Amino acid sequence: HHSYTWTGALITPCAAEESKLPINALSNSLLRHHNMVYATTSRSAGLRQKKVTFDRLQVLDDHYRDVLKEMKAKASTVKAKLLSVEEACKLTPPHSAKSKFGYGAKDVRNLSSKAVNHIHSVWKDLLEDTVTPIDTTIMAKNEVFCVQRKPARLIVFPDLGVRVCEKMALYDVVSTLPQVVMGSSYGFQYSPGQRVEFLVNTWKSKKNPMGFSYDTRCFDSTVTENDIRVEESIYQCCDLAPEARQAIKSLTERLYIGGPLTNSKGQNCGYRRCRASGVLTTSCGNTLTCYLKASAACRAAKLQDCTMLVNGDDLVVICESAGVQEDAASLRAFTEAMTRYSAPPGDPPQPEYDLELITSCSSNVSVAHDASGKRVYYLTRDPTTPLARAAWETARHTPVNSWLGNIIMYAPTLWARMILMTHFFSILLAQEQLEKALDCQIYGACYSIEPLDLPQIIERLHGLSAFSLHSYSPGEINRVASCLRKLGVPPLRVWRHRARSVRARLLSQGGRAATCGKYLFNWAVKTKLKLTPIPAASQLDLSGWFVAGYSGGDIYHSL
Ligand SMILES: CCc1ccc(/C=C2\SC(N[C@H](C(=O)NS(=O)(=O)c3ccc([N+](=O)[O-])cc3)c3ccc(F)cc3)=NC2=O)o1
């Protein structure tokens, strides 16, 4: 029951790989300690392979089956539709990996005959063949981090033609089934503010609240064939067209459960028997399985009033404390149950009695004060990785602009406002690219967004209070202070100075640009303004922005 088997062929790159942080005339103004930032490359693929390769064992008890029966009952109320070839094509990222069959994402988005015909043939084959394993490409991802070095993560994905077929058969399913099955516990249905709101209200719902985060060790590799078949059984509970059921069964047997791994050079690297990280069902599948195992585990551990929050493999549990000594014991039982279900912990889970001390999705709840001085909760996170990536994107253009996604997601934070906004608007100004649309990601889905719309976007997501938060917590303040000293990032006084400059320049520009200067940097001036709702704020269509997770699902949405 090994997660992977290898032939010995190396996981190769499909282009040039940089490890050291690229430096340009702008680097120093943001970060001086350049050696602490690095990018993971294929060179460390071998190390990752050893970590993700192990034997899985599963002992499924009655709690497991009891929870599953419940999940299926909810899933049976779901009705999902097949997406047309055109609709699926539209969801394909302009820069998605091209097909090995004479066409690329551009041809797919354009509905070229060649692309449409191959997709139809791939679909036909899925209906007629439910046994032959589908080929996948294994690659080492190039991600940026701050030292203290980790081996590159692996990404396994099927060909473009297959990815479009996954959309047709399962897009509607993975977009609507999770919230129906898990209710308020499905994390991807919330915007950052709504996530904090749910966490806060949940924590208050308890007489004596207690909570903890549970980090599974290499979750993808712990997903067994059984887990993937159980996932399919859940999808099949939905009201689906017979053609969709066949396609889902086929995709499960031939791709989701496992298959051969091929490097960029076309050499067989081995075989997979665990979760593929680059398929449409990755996020929904992990979310369902994690929720199923954790739910069953809570019962086995006898935790009282268990409220969960799941986002793929990230898990948050808030419940009624049965006492400090009892909580620590119950948690140990939880871990033991999760382990029996093939989901051992990476790091020992610890009970917390302070909401702000629980970290999940690399985030945590914190509190500040709005213009009225009222206590306001918001989502933040350790800025280390965002800043390292911001440094990289400062001297290198990338497919995904993490700084933009981070501003949108953490707009209310001290670090995003003082540093990210100031630094990058200064850059956008100097190059006059404020109106240029940029790609970023939100819950795994790719979105093309223009910087000029940030004020509106942030207002809709976080409200006007995002532009006026102050008096952050000492804990947050010092975590940011530490990070800046570690990376060698200039202090507040410097950023405030730059913000006034950036702010003044934006105000001069006028229109959309002035709005950015007025709202985004109102904290830079000594005498604040009023800051009132933005007229075009409602015009924005943020409908499918916070509905589901699509990490590795090759999903696109143009704003
Ligand atoms: C890493 C070390 C560090 C830097 C900043 C802090 C802590 C801060 S900064 C702050 N507030 C200012 C701010 O709002 N100033 S004001 O002039 O807008 C202001 C001051 C007082 C009030 N008031 O109501 O009393 C309102 C607004 C700030 C917010 C966002 C940002 F990116 C930088 C600085 N509150 C805090 O706890 O720690």
Swiss-Prot record:
Effect upon mutating T281V: Almost complete loss of RdRp activity
Q: How is it modified after translation?
A: The N-terminus is phosphorylated by host PRK2/PKN2.
Q: Where in the cell is it found?
A: Host cytoplasm; Host endoplasmic reticulum membrane
Explain how, and how many, cofactor molecules are bound.
Binds 2 magnesium ion that constitute a dinuclear catalytic metal center.
Catalysed reactions, semicolon-separated = RNA(n) + a ribonucleoside 5'-triphosphate = RNA(n+1) + diphosphate
Q: Which domain of life is it from?
A: Viruses
Q: Cite the RdRp catalytic domain residue spans from the record.
A: 209-327
Stated regulation of activity: Activity is up-regulated by PRK2/PKN2-mediated phosphorylation.
Phosphoserine: modified positions: S29, S42
Outcome recorded upon mutating T282K = Complete loss of RdRp activity
Binding of Mg(2+) 2 occurs at D215, D313, D314
The annotated subunit structure for this chain is:
Homooligomer. Interacts with non-structural protein 5A. Interacts with host VAPB. Interacts with host PRK2/PKN2. Interacts with host HNRNPA1 and SEPT6; these interactions facilitate the viral replication. Part of the replication complex composed of NS2, NS3, NS4A, NS4B, NS5A and the RNA-directed RNA polymerase embedded in an ER-derived membranous web.
**Entry function:** RNA-dependent RNA polymerase that performs primer-template recognition and RNA synthesis during viral replication. Initiates RNA transcription/replication at a flavin adenine dinucleotide (FAD), resulting in a 5'- FAD cap on viral RNAs. In this way, recognition of viral 5' RNA by host pattern recognition receptors can be bypassed, thereby evading activation of antiviral pathways.
Protein name from the UniProt record:
RNA-directed RNA polymerase
Instruction: Please tell me the species this chain comes from.
Output: Hepatitis C virus genotype 1b (isolate BK) (HCV)
